[model samples]
Target: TCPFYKKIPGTGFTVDAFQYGVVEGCTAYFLTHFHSDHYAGLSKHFTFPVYCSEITGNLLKNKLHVQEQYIHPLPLDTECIVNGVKVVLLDANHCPGAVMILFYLPNGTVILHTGDFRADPSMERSLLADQKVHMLYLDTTYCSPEYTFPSQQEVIRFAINTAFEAVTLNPHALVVCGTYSIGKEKVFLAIADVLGSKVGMSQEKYKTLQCLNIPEINSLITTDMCSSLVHLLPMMQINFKGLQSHLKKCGGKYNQILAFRPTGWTHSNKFTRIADVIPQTKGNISIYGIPYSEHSSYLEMKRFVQWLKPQKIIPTVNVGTWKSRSTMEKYFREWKLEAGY
Candidate 1:
């Protein structure tokens, strides 16, 4: 069953956090993660002492470029009371800086908000020892039973293998792909480490990696440094016309072009779109999918809920707007029906 719903300032009286409205007099606000959906409307609406983990603080200041004065960093597993409400931050295990928040009220009630998280054994190994929890706000993004994913290590291996296969087939080519500032860096780094000297990046790529503090994988050259390599790495994109223009400028300069297509939604349909947009050419242009995702899959979400064993479960992130909440209610109903509860 769903937990309690409070009237947030933005949406008169709704459970979702995406709406914008006047601030309620809730003494404190606890952010579970730095994802845009989780922390949205924070800088604008609420001015209460906002609590988050140190990792989230770094991500906000460095990745999202948010101001520091507004964020109050707290260590994980330590309880801090704000206006009589107790809060504890735990590793979310989904992303590098994501976190799960446990709120304890003086009235002997507790609420757990499991921000986008996965059921990787490493995560379970780290978090299973925490004290008993009650009332969980889970990430039901993939709560439907139809979804599943390979283990985290397997996913990483797949990413590495996909890039290796592409480069192996086309020894001399300029490969370009797009990734998020945070999640995709790891994928690209793994691929570059395996390729060693064969792969090169653009100047922007170097700057982005340096900004993210990701270790340099190999002698990958940025666009500015492409002259050092015998082959040039002109960063390409999924846009068909845009890629054609880039290829036109450097056509025949390299033996082949390896392009990494960006996935749109967190579903297989993205691959369908990639198939349609892939450039048509006789020249050896290799394309492959890495199947890397940021959010928890179906079973991950279910296992997290079962492991926490909270008194109640609340699902946010997906239930941001009123329209979205209506959709979410249907989703929850389906979950209940499937479970025969």
Candidate 2:
């Protein structure tokens, strides 16, 4: 008899909202972001009045291509009524349009739902000062000290420094760093901002970003806005082998190439495959690891929970039993509470 149902398959839950007639007495469902885990059932399986931030609404229609009719666009920090249930959207700081939700039930129960979020001090302050909350649905992606991630700025600076240093040292080598279309867009922007020109994007990445409607970038073209900046744009591609000919075609035009890694490349793993296969034929190549993640770290998550002080705290992403849920258990227990189904 819970108000929520997790019905969608492969989402680790049945249905995350109330079924057709099951939720007739309940209010409405509030989707926090565009992540599949949160909105997996929305497109065709479920049809209900959904509420989210304005940015999230546009992203659903534009970025993710989800075309649902029952959507209510709410501004950030503003309260809106959804079938007698009062709710608000808070910045999740995960992506450009992602958000954390705060649900205020008619019975005076306040649930602070932290959709995947990175801890930004500004966002924390905004949430803490907004309202008094009762239950907190937190994101425990990194609830252990072992999952502590470097700051986004730090990661960007590290990647830039590593790539630039490689280029400066070997003026006759091409270095490639691999990154995602949207994920590494900023990294390339940072590079282009430093280089004062637009970096080239591979054909595949260009197509992907085109379909995605990535805001500022267009087929490796740098705009006037970035012309005054000094950075190098990264070539976005999933396939590394296809770029070999392109790399060689450049000849001595570029001595170093920076490529962002998609997966299987990490600080701990070390660069073995790229070094072994992509020899120093025309220019030297090196892979530098710059750690950047969209989710929040342990300290950031802890700080969020501490600030909200919600009566009931439920973590969305799990780290490990002992680390995430268990760690969160200790904190909630300190407040004399435990997770309830």
Candidate 3:
């Protein structure tokens, strides 16, 4: 059975719990990424030093207006000391500046905090591979059969094909690529590269992208609406009404809109053909759902947990209801039995 903890069991460091106010013995707050849920409790007045990836640090300062002194950017794949405790950051493969944190205590104990992660093969090469993790704070977002979706790469390919074919069919269609606050960047980046088109995004989003500091994706971003047919917006405003208003305001001859709502929930790999695509249409706007996700699938989590062999696994997400948590707990025992001799 796995344990569920809101903070590190024996340490003063709290990850993703800033809004709850200062803990009795807390010394620092660790944020995994710029996502709101992870950094839910952050305040500009909070005194503790915030440890996060460089991208996240910039985002906190730029987006949240956090004080510069509190934001400590930790370089990935390296070791650092704070509060006399050893810490290491590893790329989480979730979002920009998103990382899984490993804490080494003075008592020869290692604790892993997977701050909303997708199980990546590269994780095997990190310093985490060298030691036996005593405690694991797991991201159980998709820790059951309900979320056993396919790979992110496979889904990205389908999304690209879907958009490309749609574009070819309707040359006048405006491509509105949907996105979250920080994730689903690969989808937008790939479209600009493959379509060879100028990508238009909001000025705020452009600033966020700049903080990401990746030259490869930053090659063609523009804020001018008239400059490009492809635009980026939050997934909420990707509907027909949203596009209609945007086009009217932006004054685009782009008669129709091909909306790509690339999220993990809308998953289907059985049919890759364009004819029976995951299409939702009401009028001129067509919504094609793409299964693009950064969270690990049930199979992926099982494989990772087995390989980690942590003394204890703590479910981080999907814990509101006891049933889902139980479903996640069931696998931990099974994995232990299978992995053990």
- For each candidate in turn, the TM-score is 0.70, 0.69, 0.93
In terms of lDDT, the poorest run of 10 residues in model 1 is: 7-16
Displacement of the residue 242 alpha carbon in candidate 2, Å = 6.0
Q: Clashing pairs in model 1?
A: 10-20, 10-21, 135-311, 202-222, 202-223, 203-223
Choose 1 or 3, whichever is better by TM-score: 3
Local distance difference test scores for all models: 0.54, 0.54, 0.80
Preferred candidate (lDDT higher): 2 or 3? 3
lDDT top scorer: 3
Candidate 1, 73-129: lDDT as tens digits = 888767776555666677776665567766666666666666676655455554345
- Give the top-scoring candidate (TM-score): 3
Clashes of each: 6, 37, 2
Off by over 4 Å in 3: 1-4, 216-218, 267-276
| 1 versus 2: better TM-score goes to | 1
- lDDT string for model 3 (1-341, tens) is 11237577667887877767666677888888888877876767667889999989888888777899888998988999988889999988888889999999888889999988999777888897788989998998877665666677776787778768878888787888987788887887777677778789889888888888887655678888677878998888988788778768766578888888877764464445333556789878788887677899878888888888889888888788888778778888899999991
